[PDB]
Curated annotation (Swiss-Prot):
Transmembrane segments: none annotated. It comes from Homo sapiens. Ubiquitous, with highest expression in testis. Belongs to the PI3/PI4-kinase family. ATM subfamily. Forms a heterodimer with ATRIP, forming the ATR-ATRIP complex. Present in a complex containing ATRIP and RPA-coated single-stranded DNA. Binds to DNA, and to UV-damaged DNA with higher affinity. Interacts with MSH2 and HDAC2. Present in a complex containing CHD4 and HDAC2. Interacts with EEF1E1, the interaction is enhanced by UV irradiation. Interacts with CLSPN and CEP164. Interacts with TELO2 and TTI1. Interacts with BCR-ABL after genotoxic stress. Interacts with UHRF2; this interaction promotes ATR activation. This is Serine/threonine-protein kinase ATR. It is found in: Nucleus; Chromosome; Nucleus envelope. Phosphorylated. The chain holds residues 1115 to 1253 of 2644 of the full protein. Serine/threonine protein kinase which activates checkpoint signaling upon genotoxic stresses such as ionizing radiation (IR), ultraviolet light (UV), or DNA replication stalling, thereby acting as a DNA damage sensor. Recognizes the substrate consensus sequence [ST]-Q. Phosphorylates BRCA1, CHEK1, MCM2, RAD17, RBBP8, RPA2, SMC1 and p53/TP53, which collectively inhibit DNA replication and mitosis and promote DNA repair, recombination and apoptosis. Phosphorylates 'Ser-139' of histone variant H2AX at sites of DNA damage, thereby regulating DNA damage response mechanism. It comes from the Eukaryota. The gene is ATR. It is linked to Seckel syndrome 1: A rare autosomal recessive disorder characterized by proportionate dwarfism of prenatal onset associated with low birth weight, growth retardation, severe microcephaly with a bird-headed like appearance, and intellectual disability.
Length: 139
């Protein structure tokens, strides 16, 4: 079952994500392979579902930040993947994403003006009433 697969993914929990993060951390893993792993991480996050990812999704965002640290060609795909991960993530609280969403947006804006803008517009729409709670915080 995809839900059964999600339950198996839930049993792996942070450690499977940590193993992916460790592979992302390693210099040896190929950037295209890392991009495939990032696509896999987005697929795994989808398989878990937003509620299942929970704190691990925030850990995944930290892993995404490690992915952000070396981006190159992968980053334009990664920025779409990060936007997809945000889209996969429950809107929850805009304030709860806080700086990490802003930090991702700033990296995305450097990679392309449009990629950050598309993510920001999606983020604002998803945040809804929550959106602008952190707008003052993200001066």
């Amino acid at each position: 079952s995809p839900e059964l697969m999600a339950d198996y993914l839930q049993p792996k929990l942070l450690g499977i994500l940590a193993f992916f993060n460790m592979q992302l951390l390693s210099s040896s893993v190929g950037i295209e392979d890392k991009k495939m792993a990032l696509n896999s991480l987005m697929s795994l996050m989808k398989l878990m579902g937003p509620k299942h990812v929970s704190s691990v999704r925030v850990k995944m965002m930290t892993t995404l930040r490690t992915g952000l640290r070396f981006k190159d060609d992968f980053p334009e795909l990664c920025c779409r993947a990060w936007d997809c991960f945000v889209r996969c993530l429950d809107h929850a609280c805009l304030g709860s994403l806080l700086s990490h969403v802003i930090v991702a947006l700033l990296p995305l804006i450097h990679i392309q003006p449009k990629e950050t803008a598309a993510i920001f517009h999606y983020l604002i729409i998803e945040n809804r009433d929550a959106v602008q709670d952190f707008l003052h915080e993200i001066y």
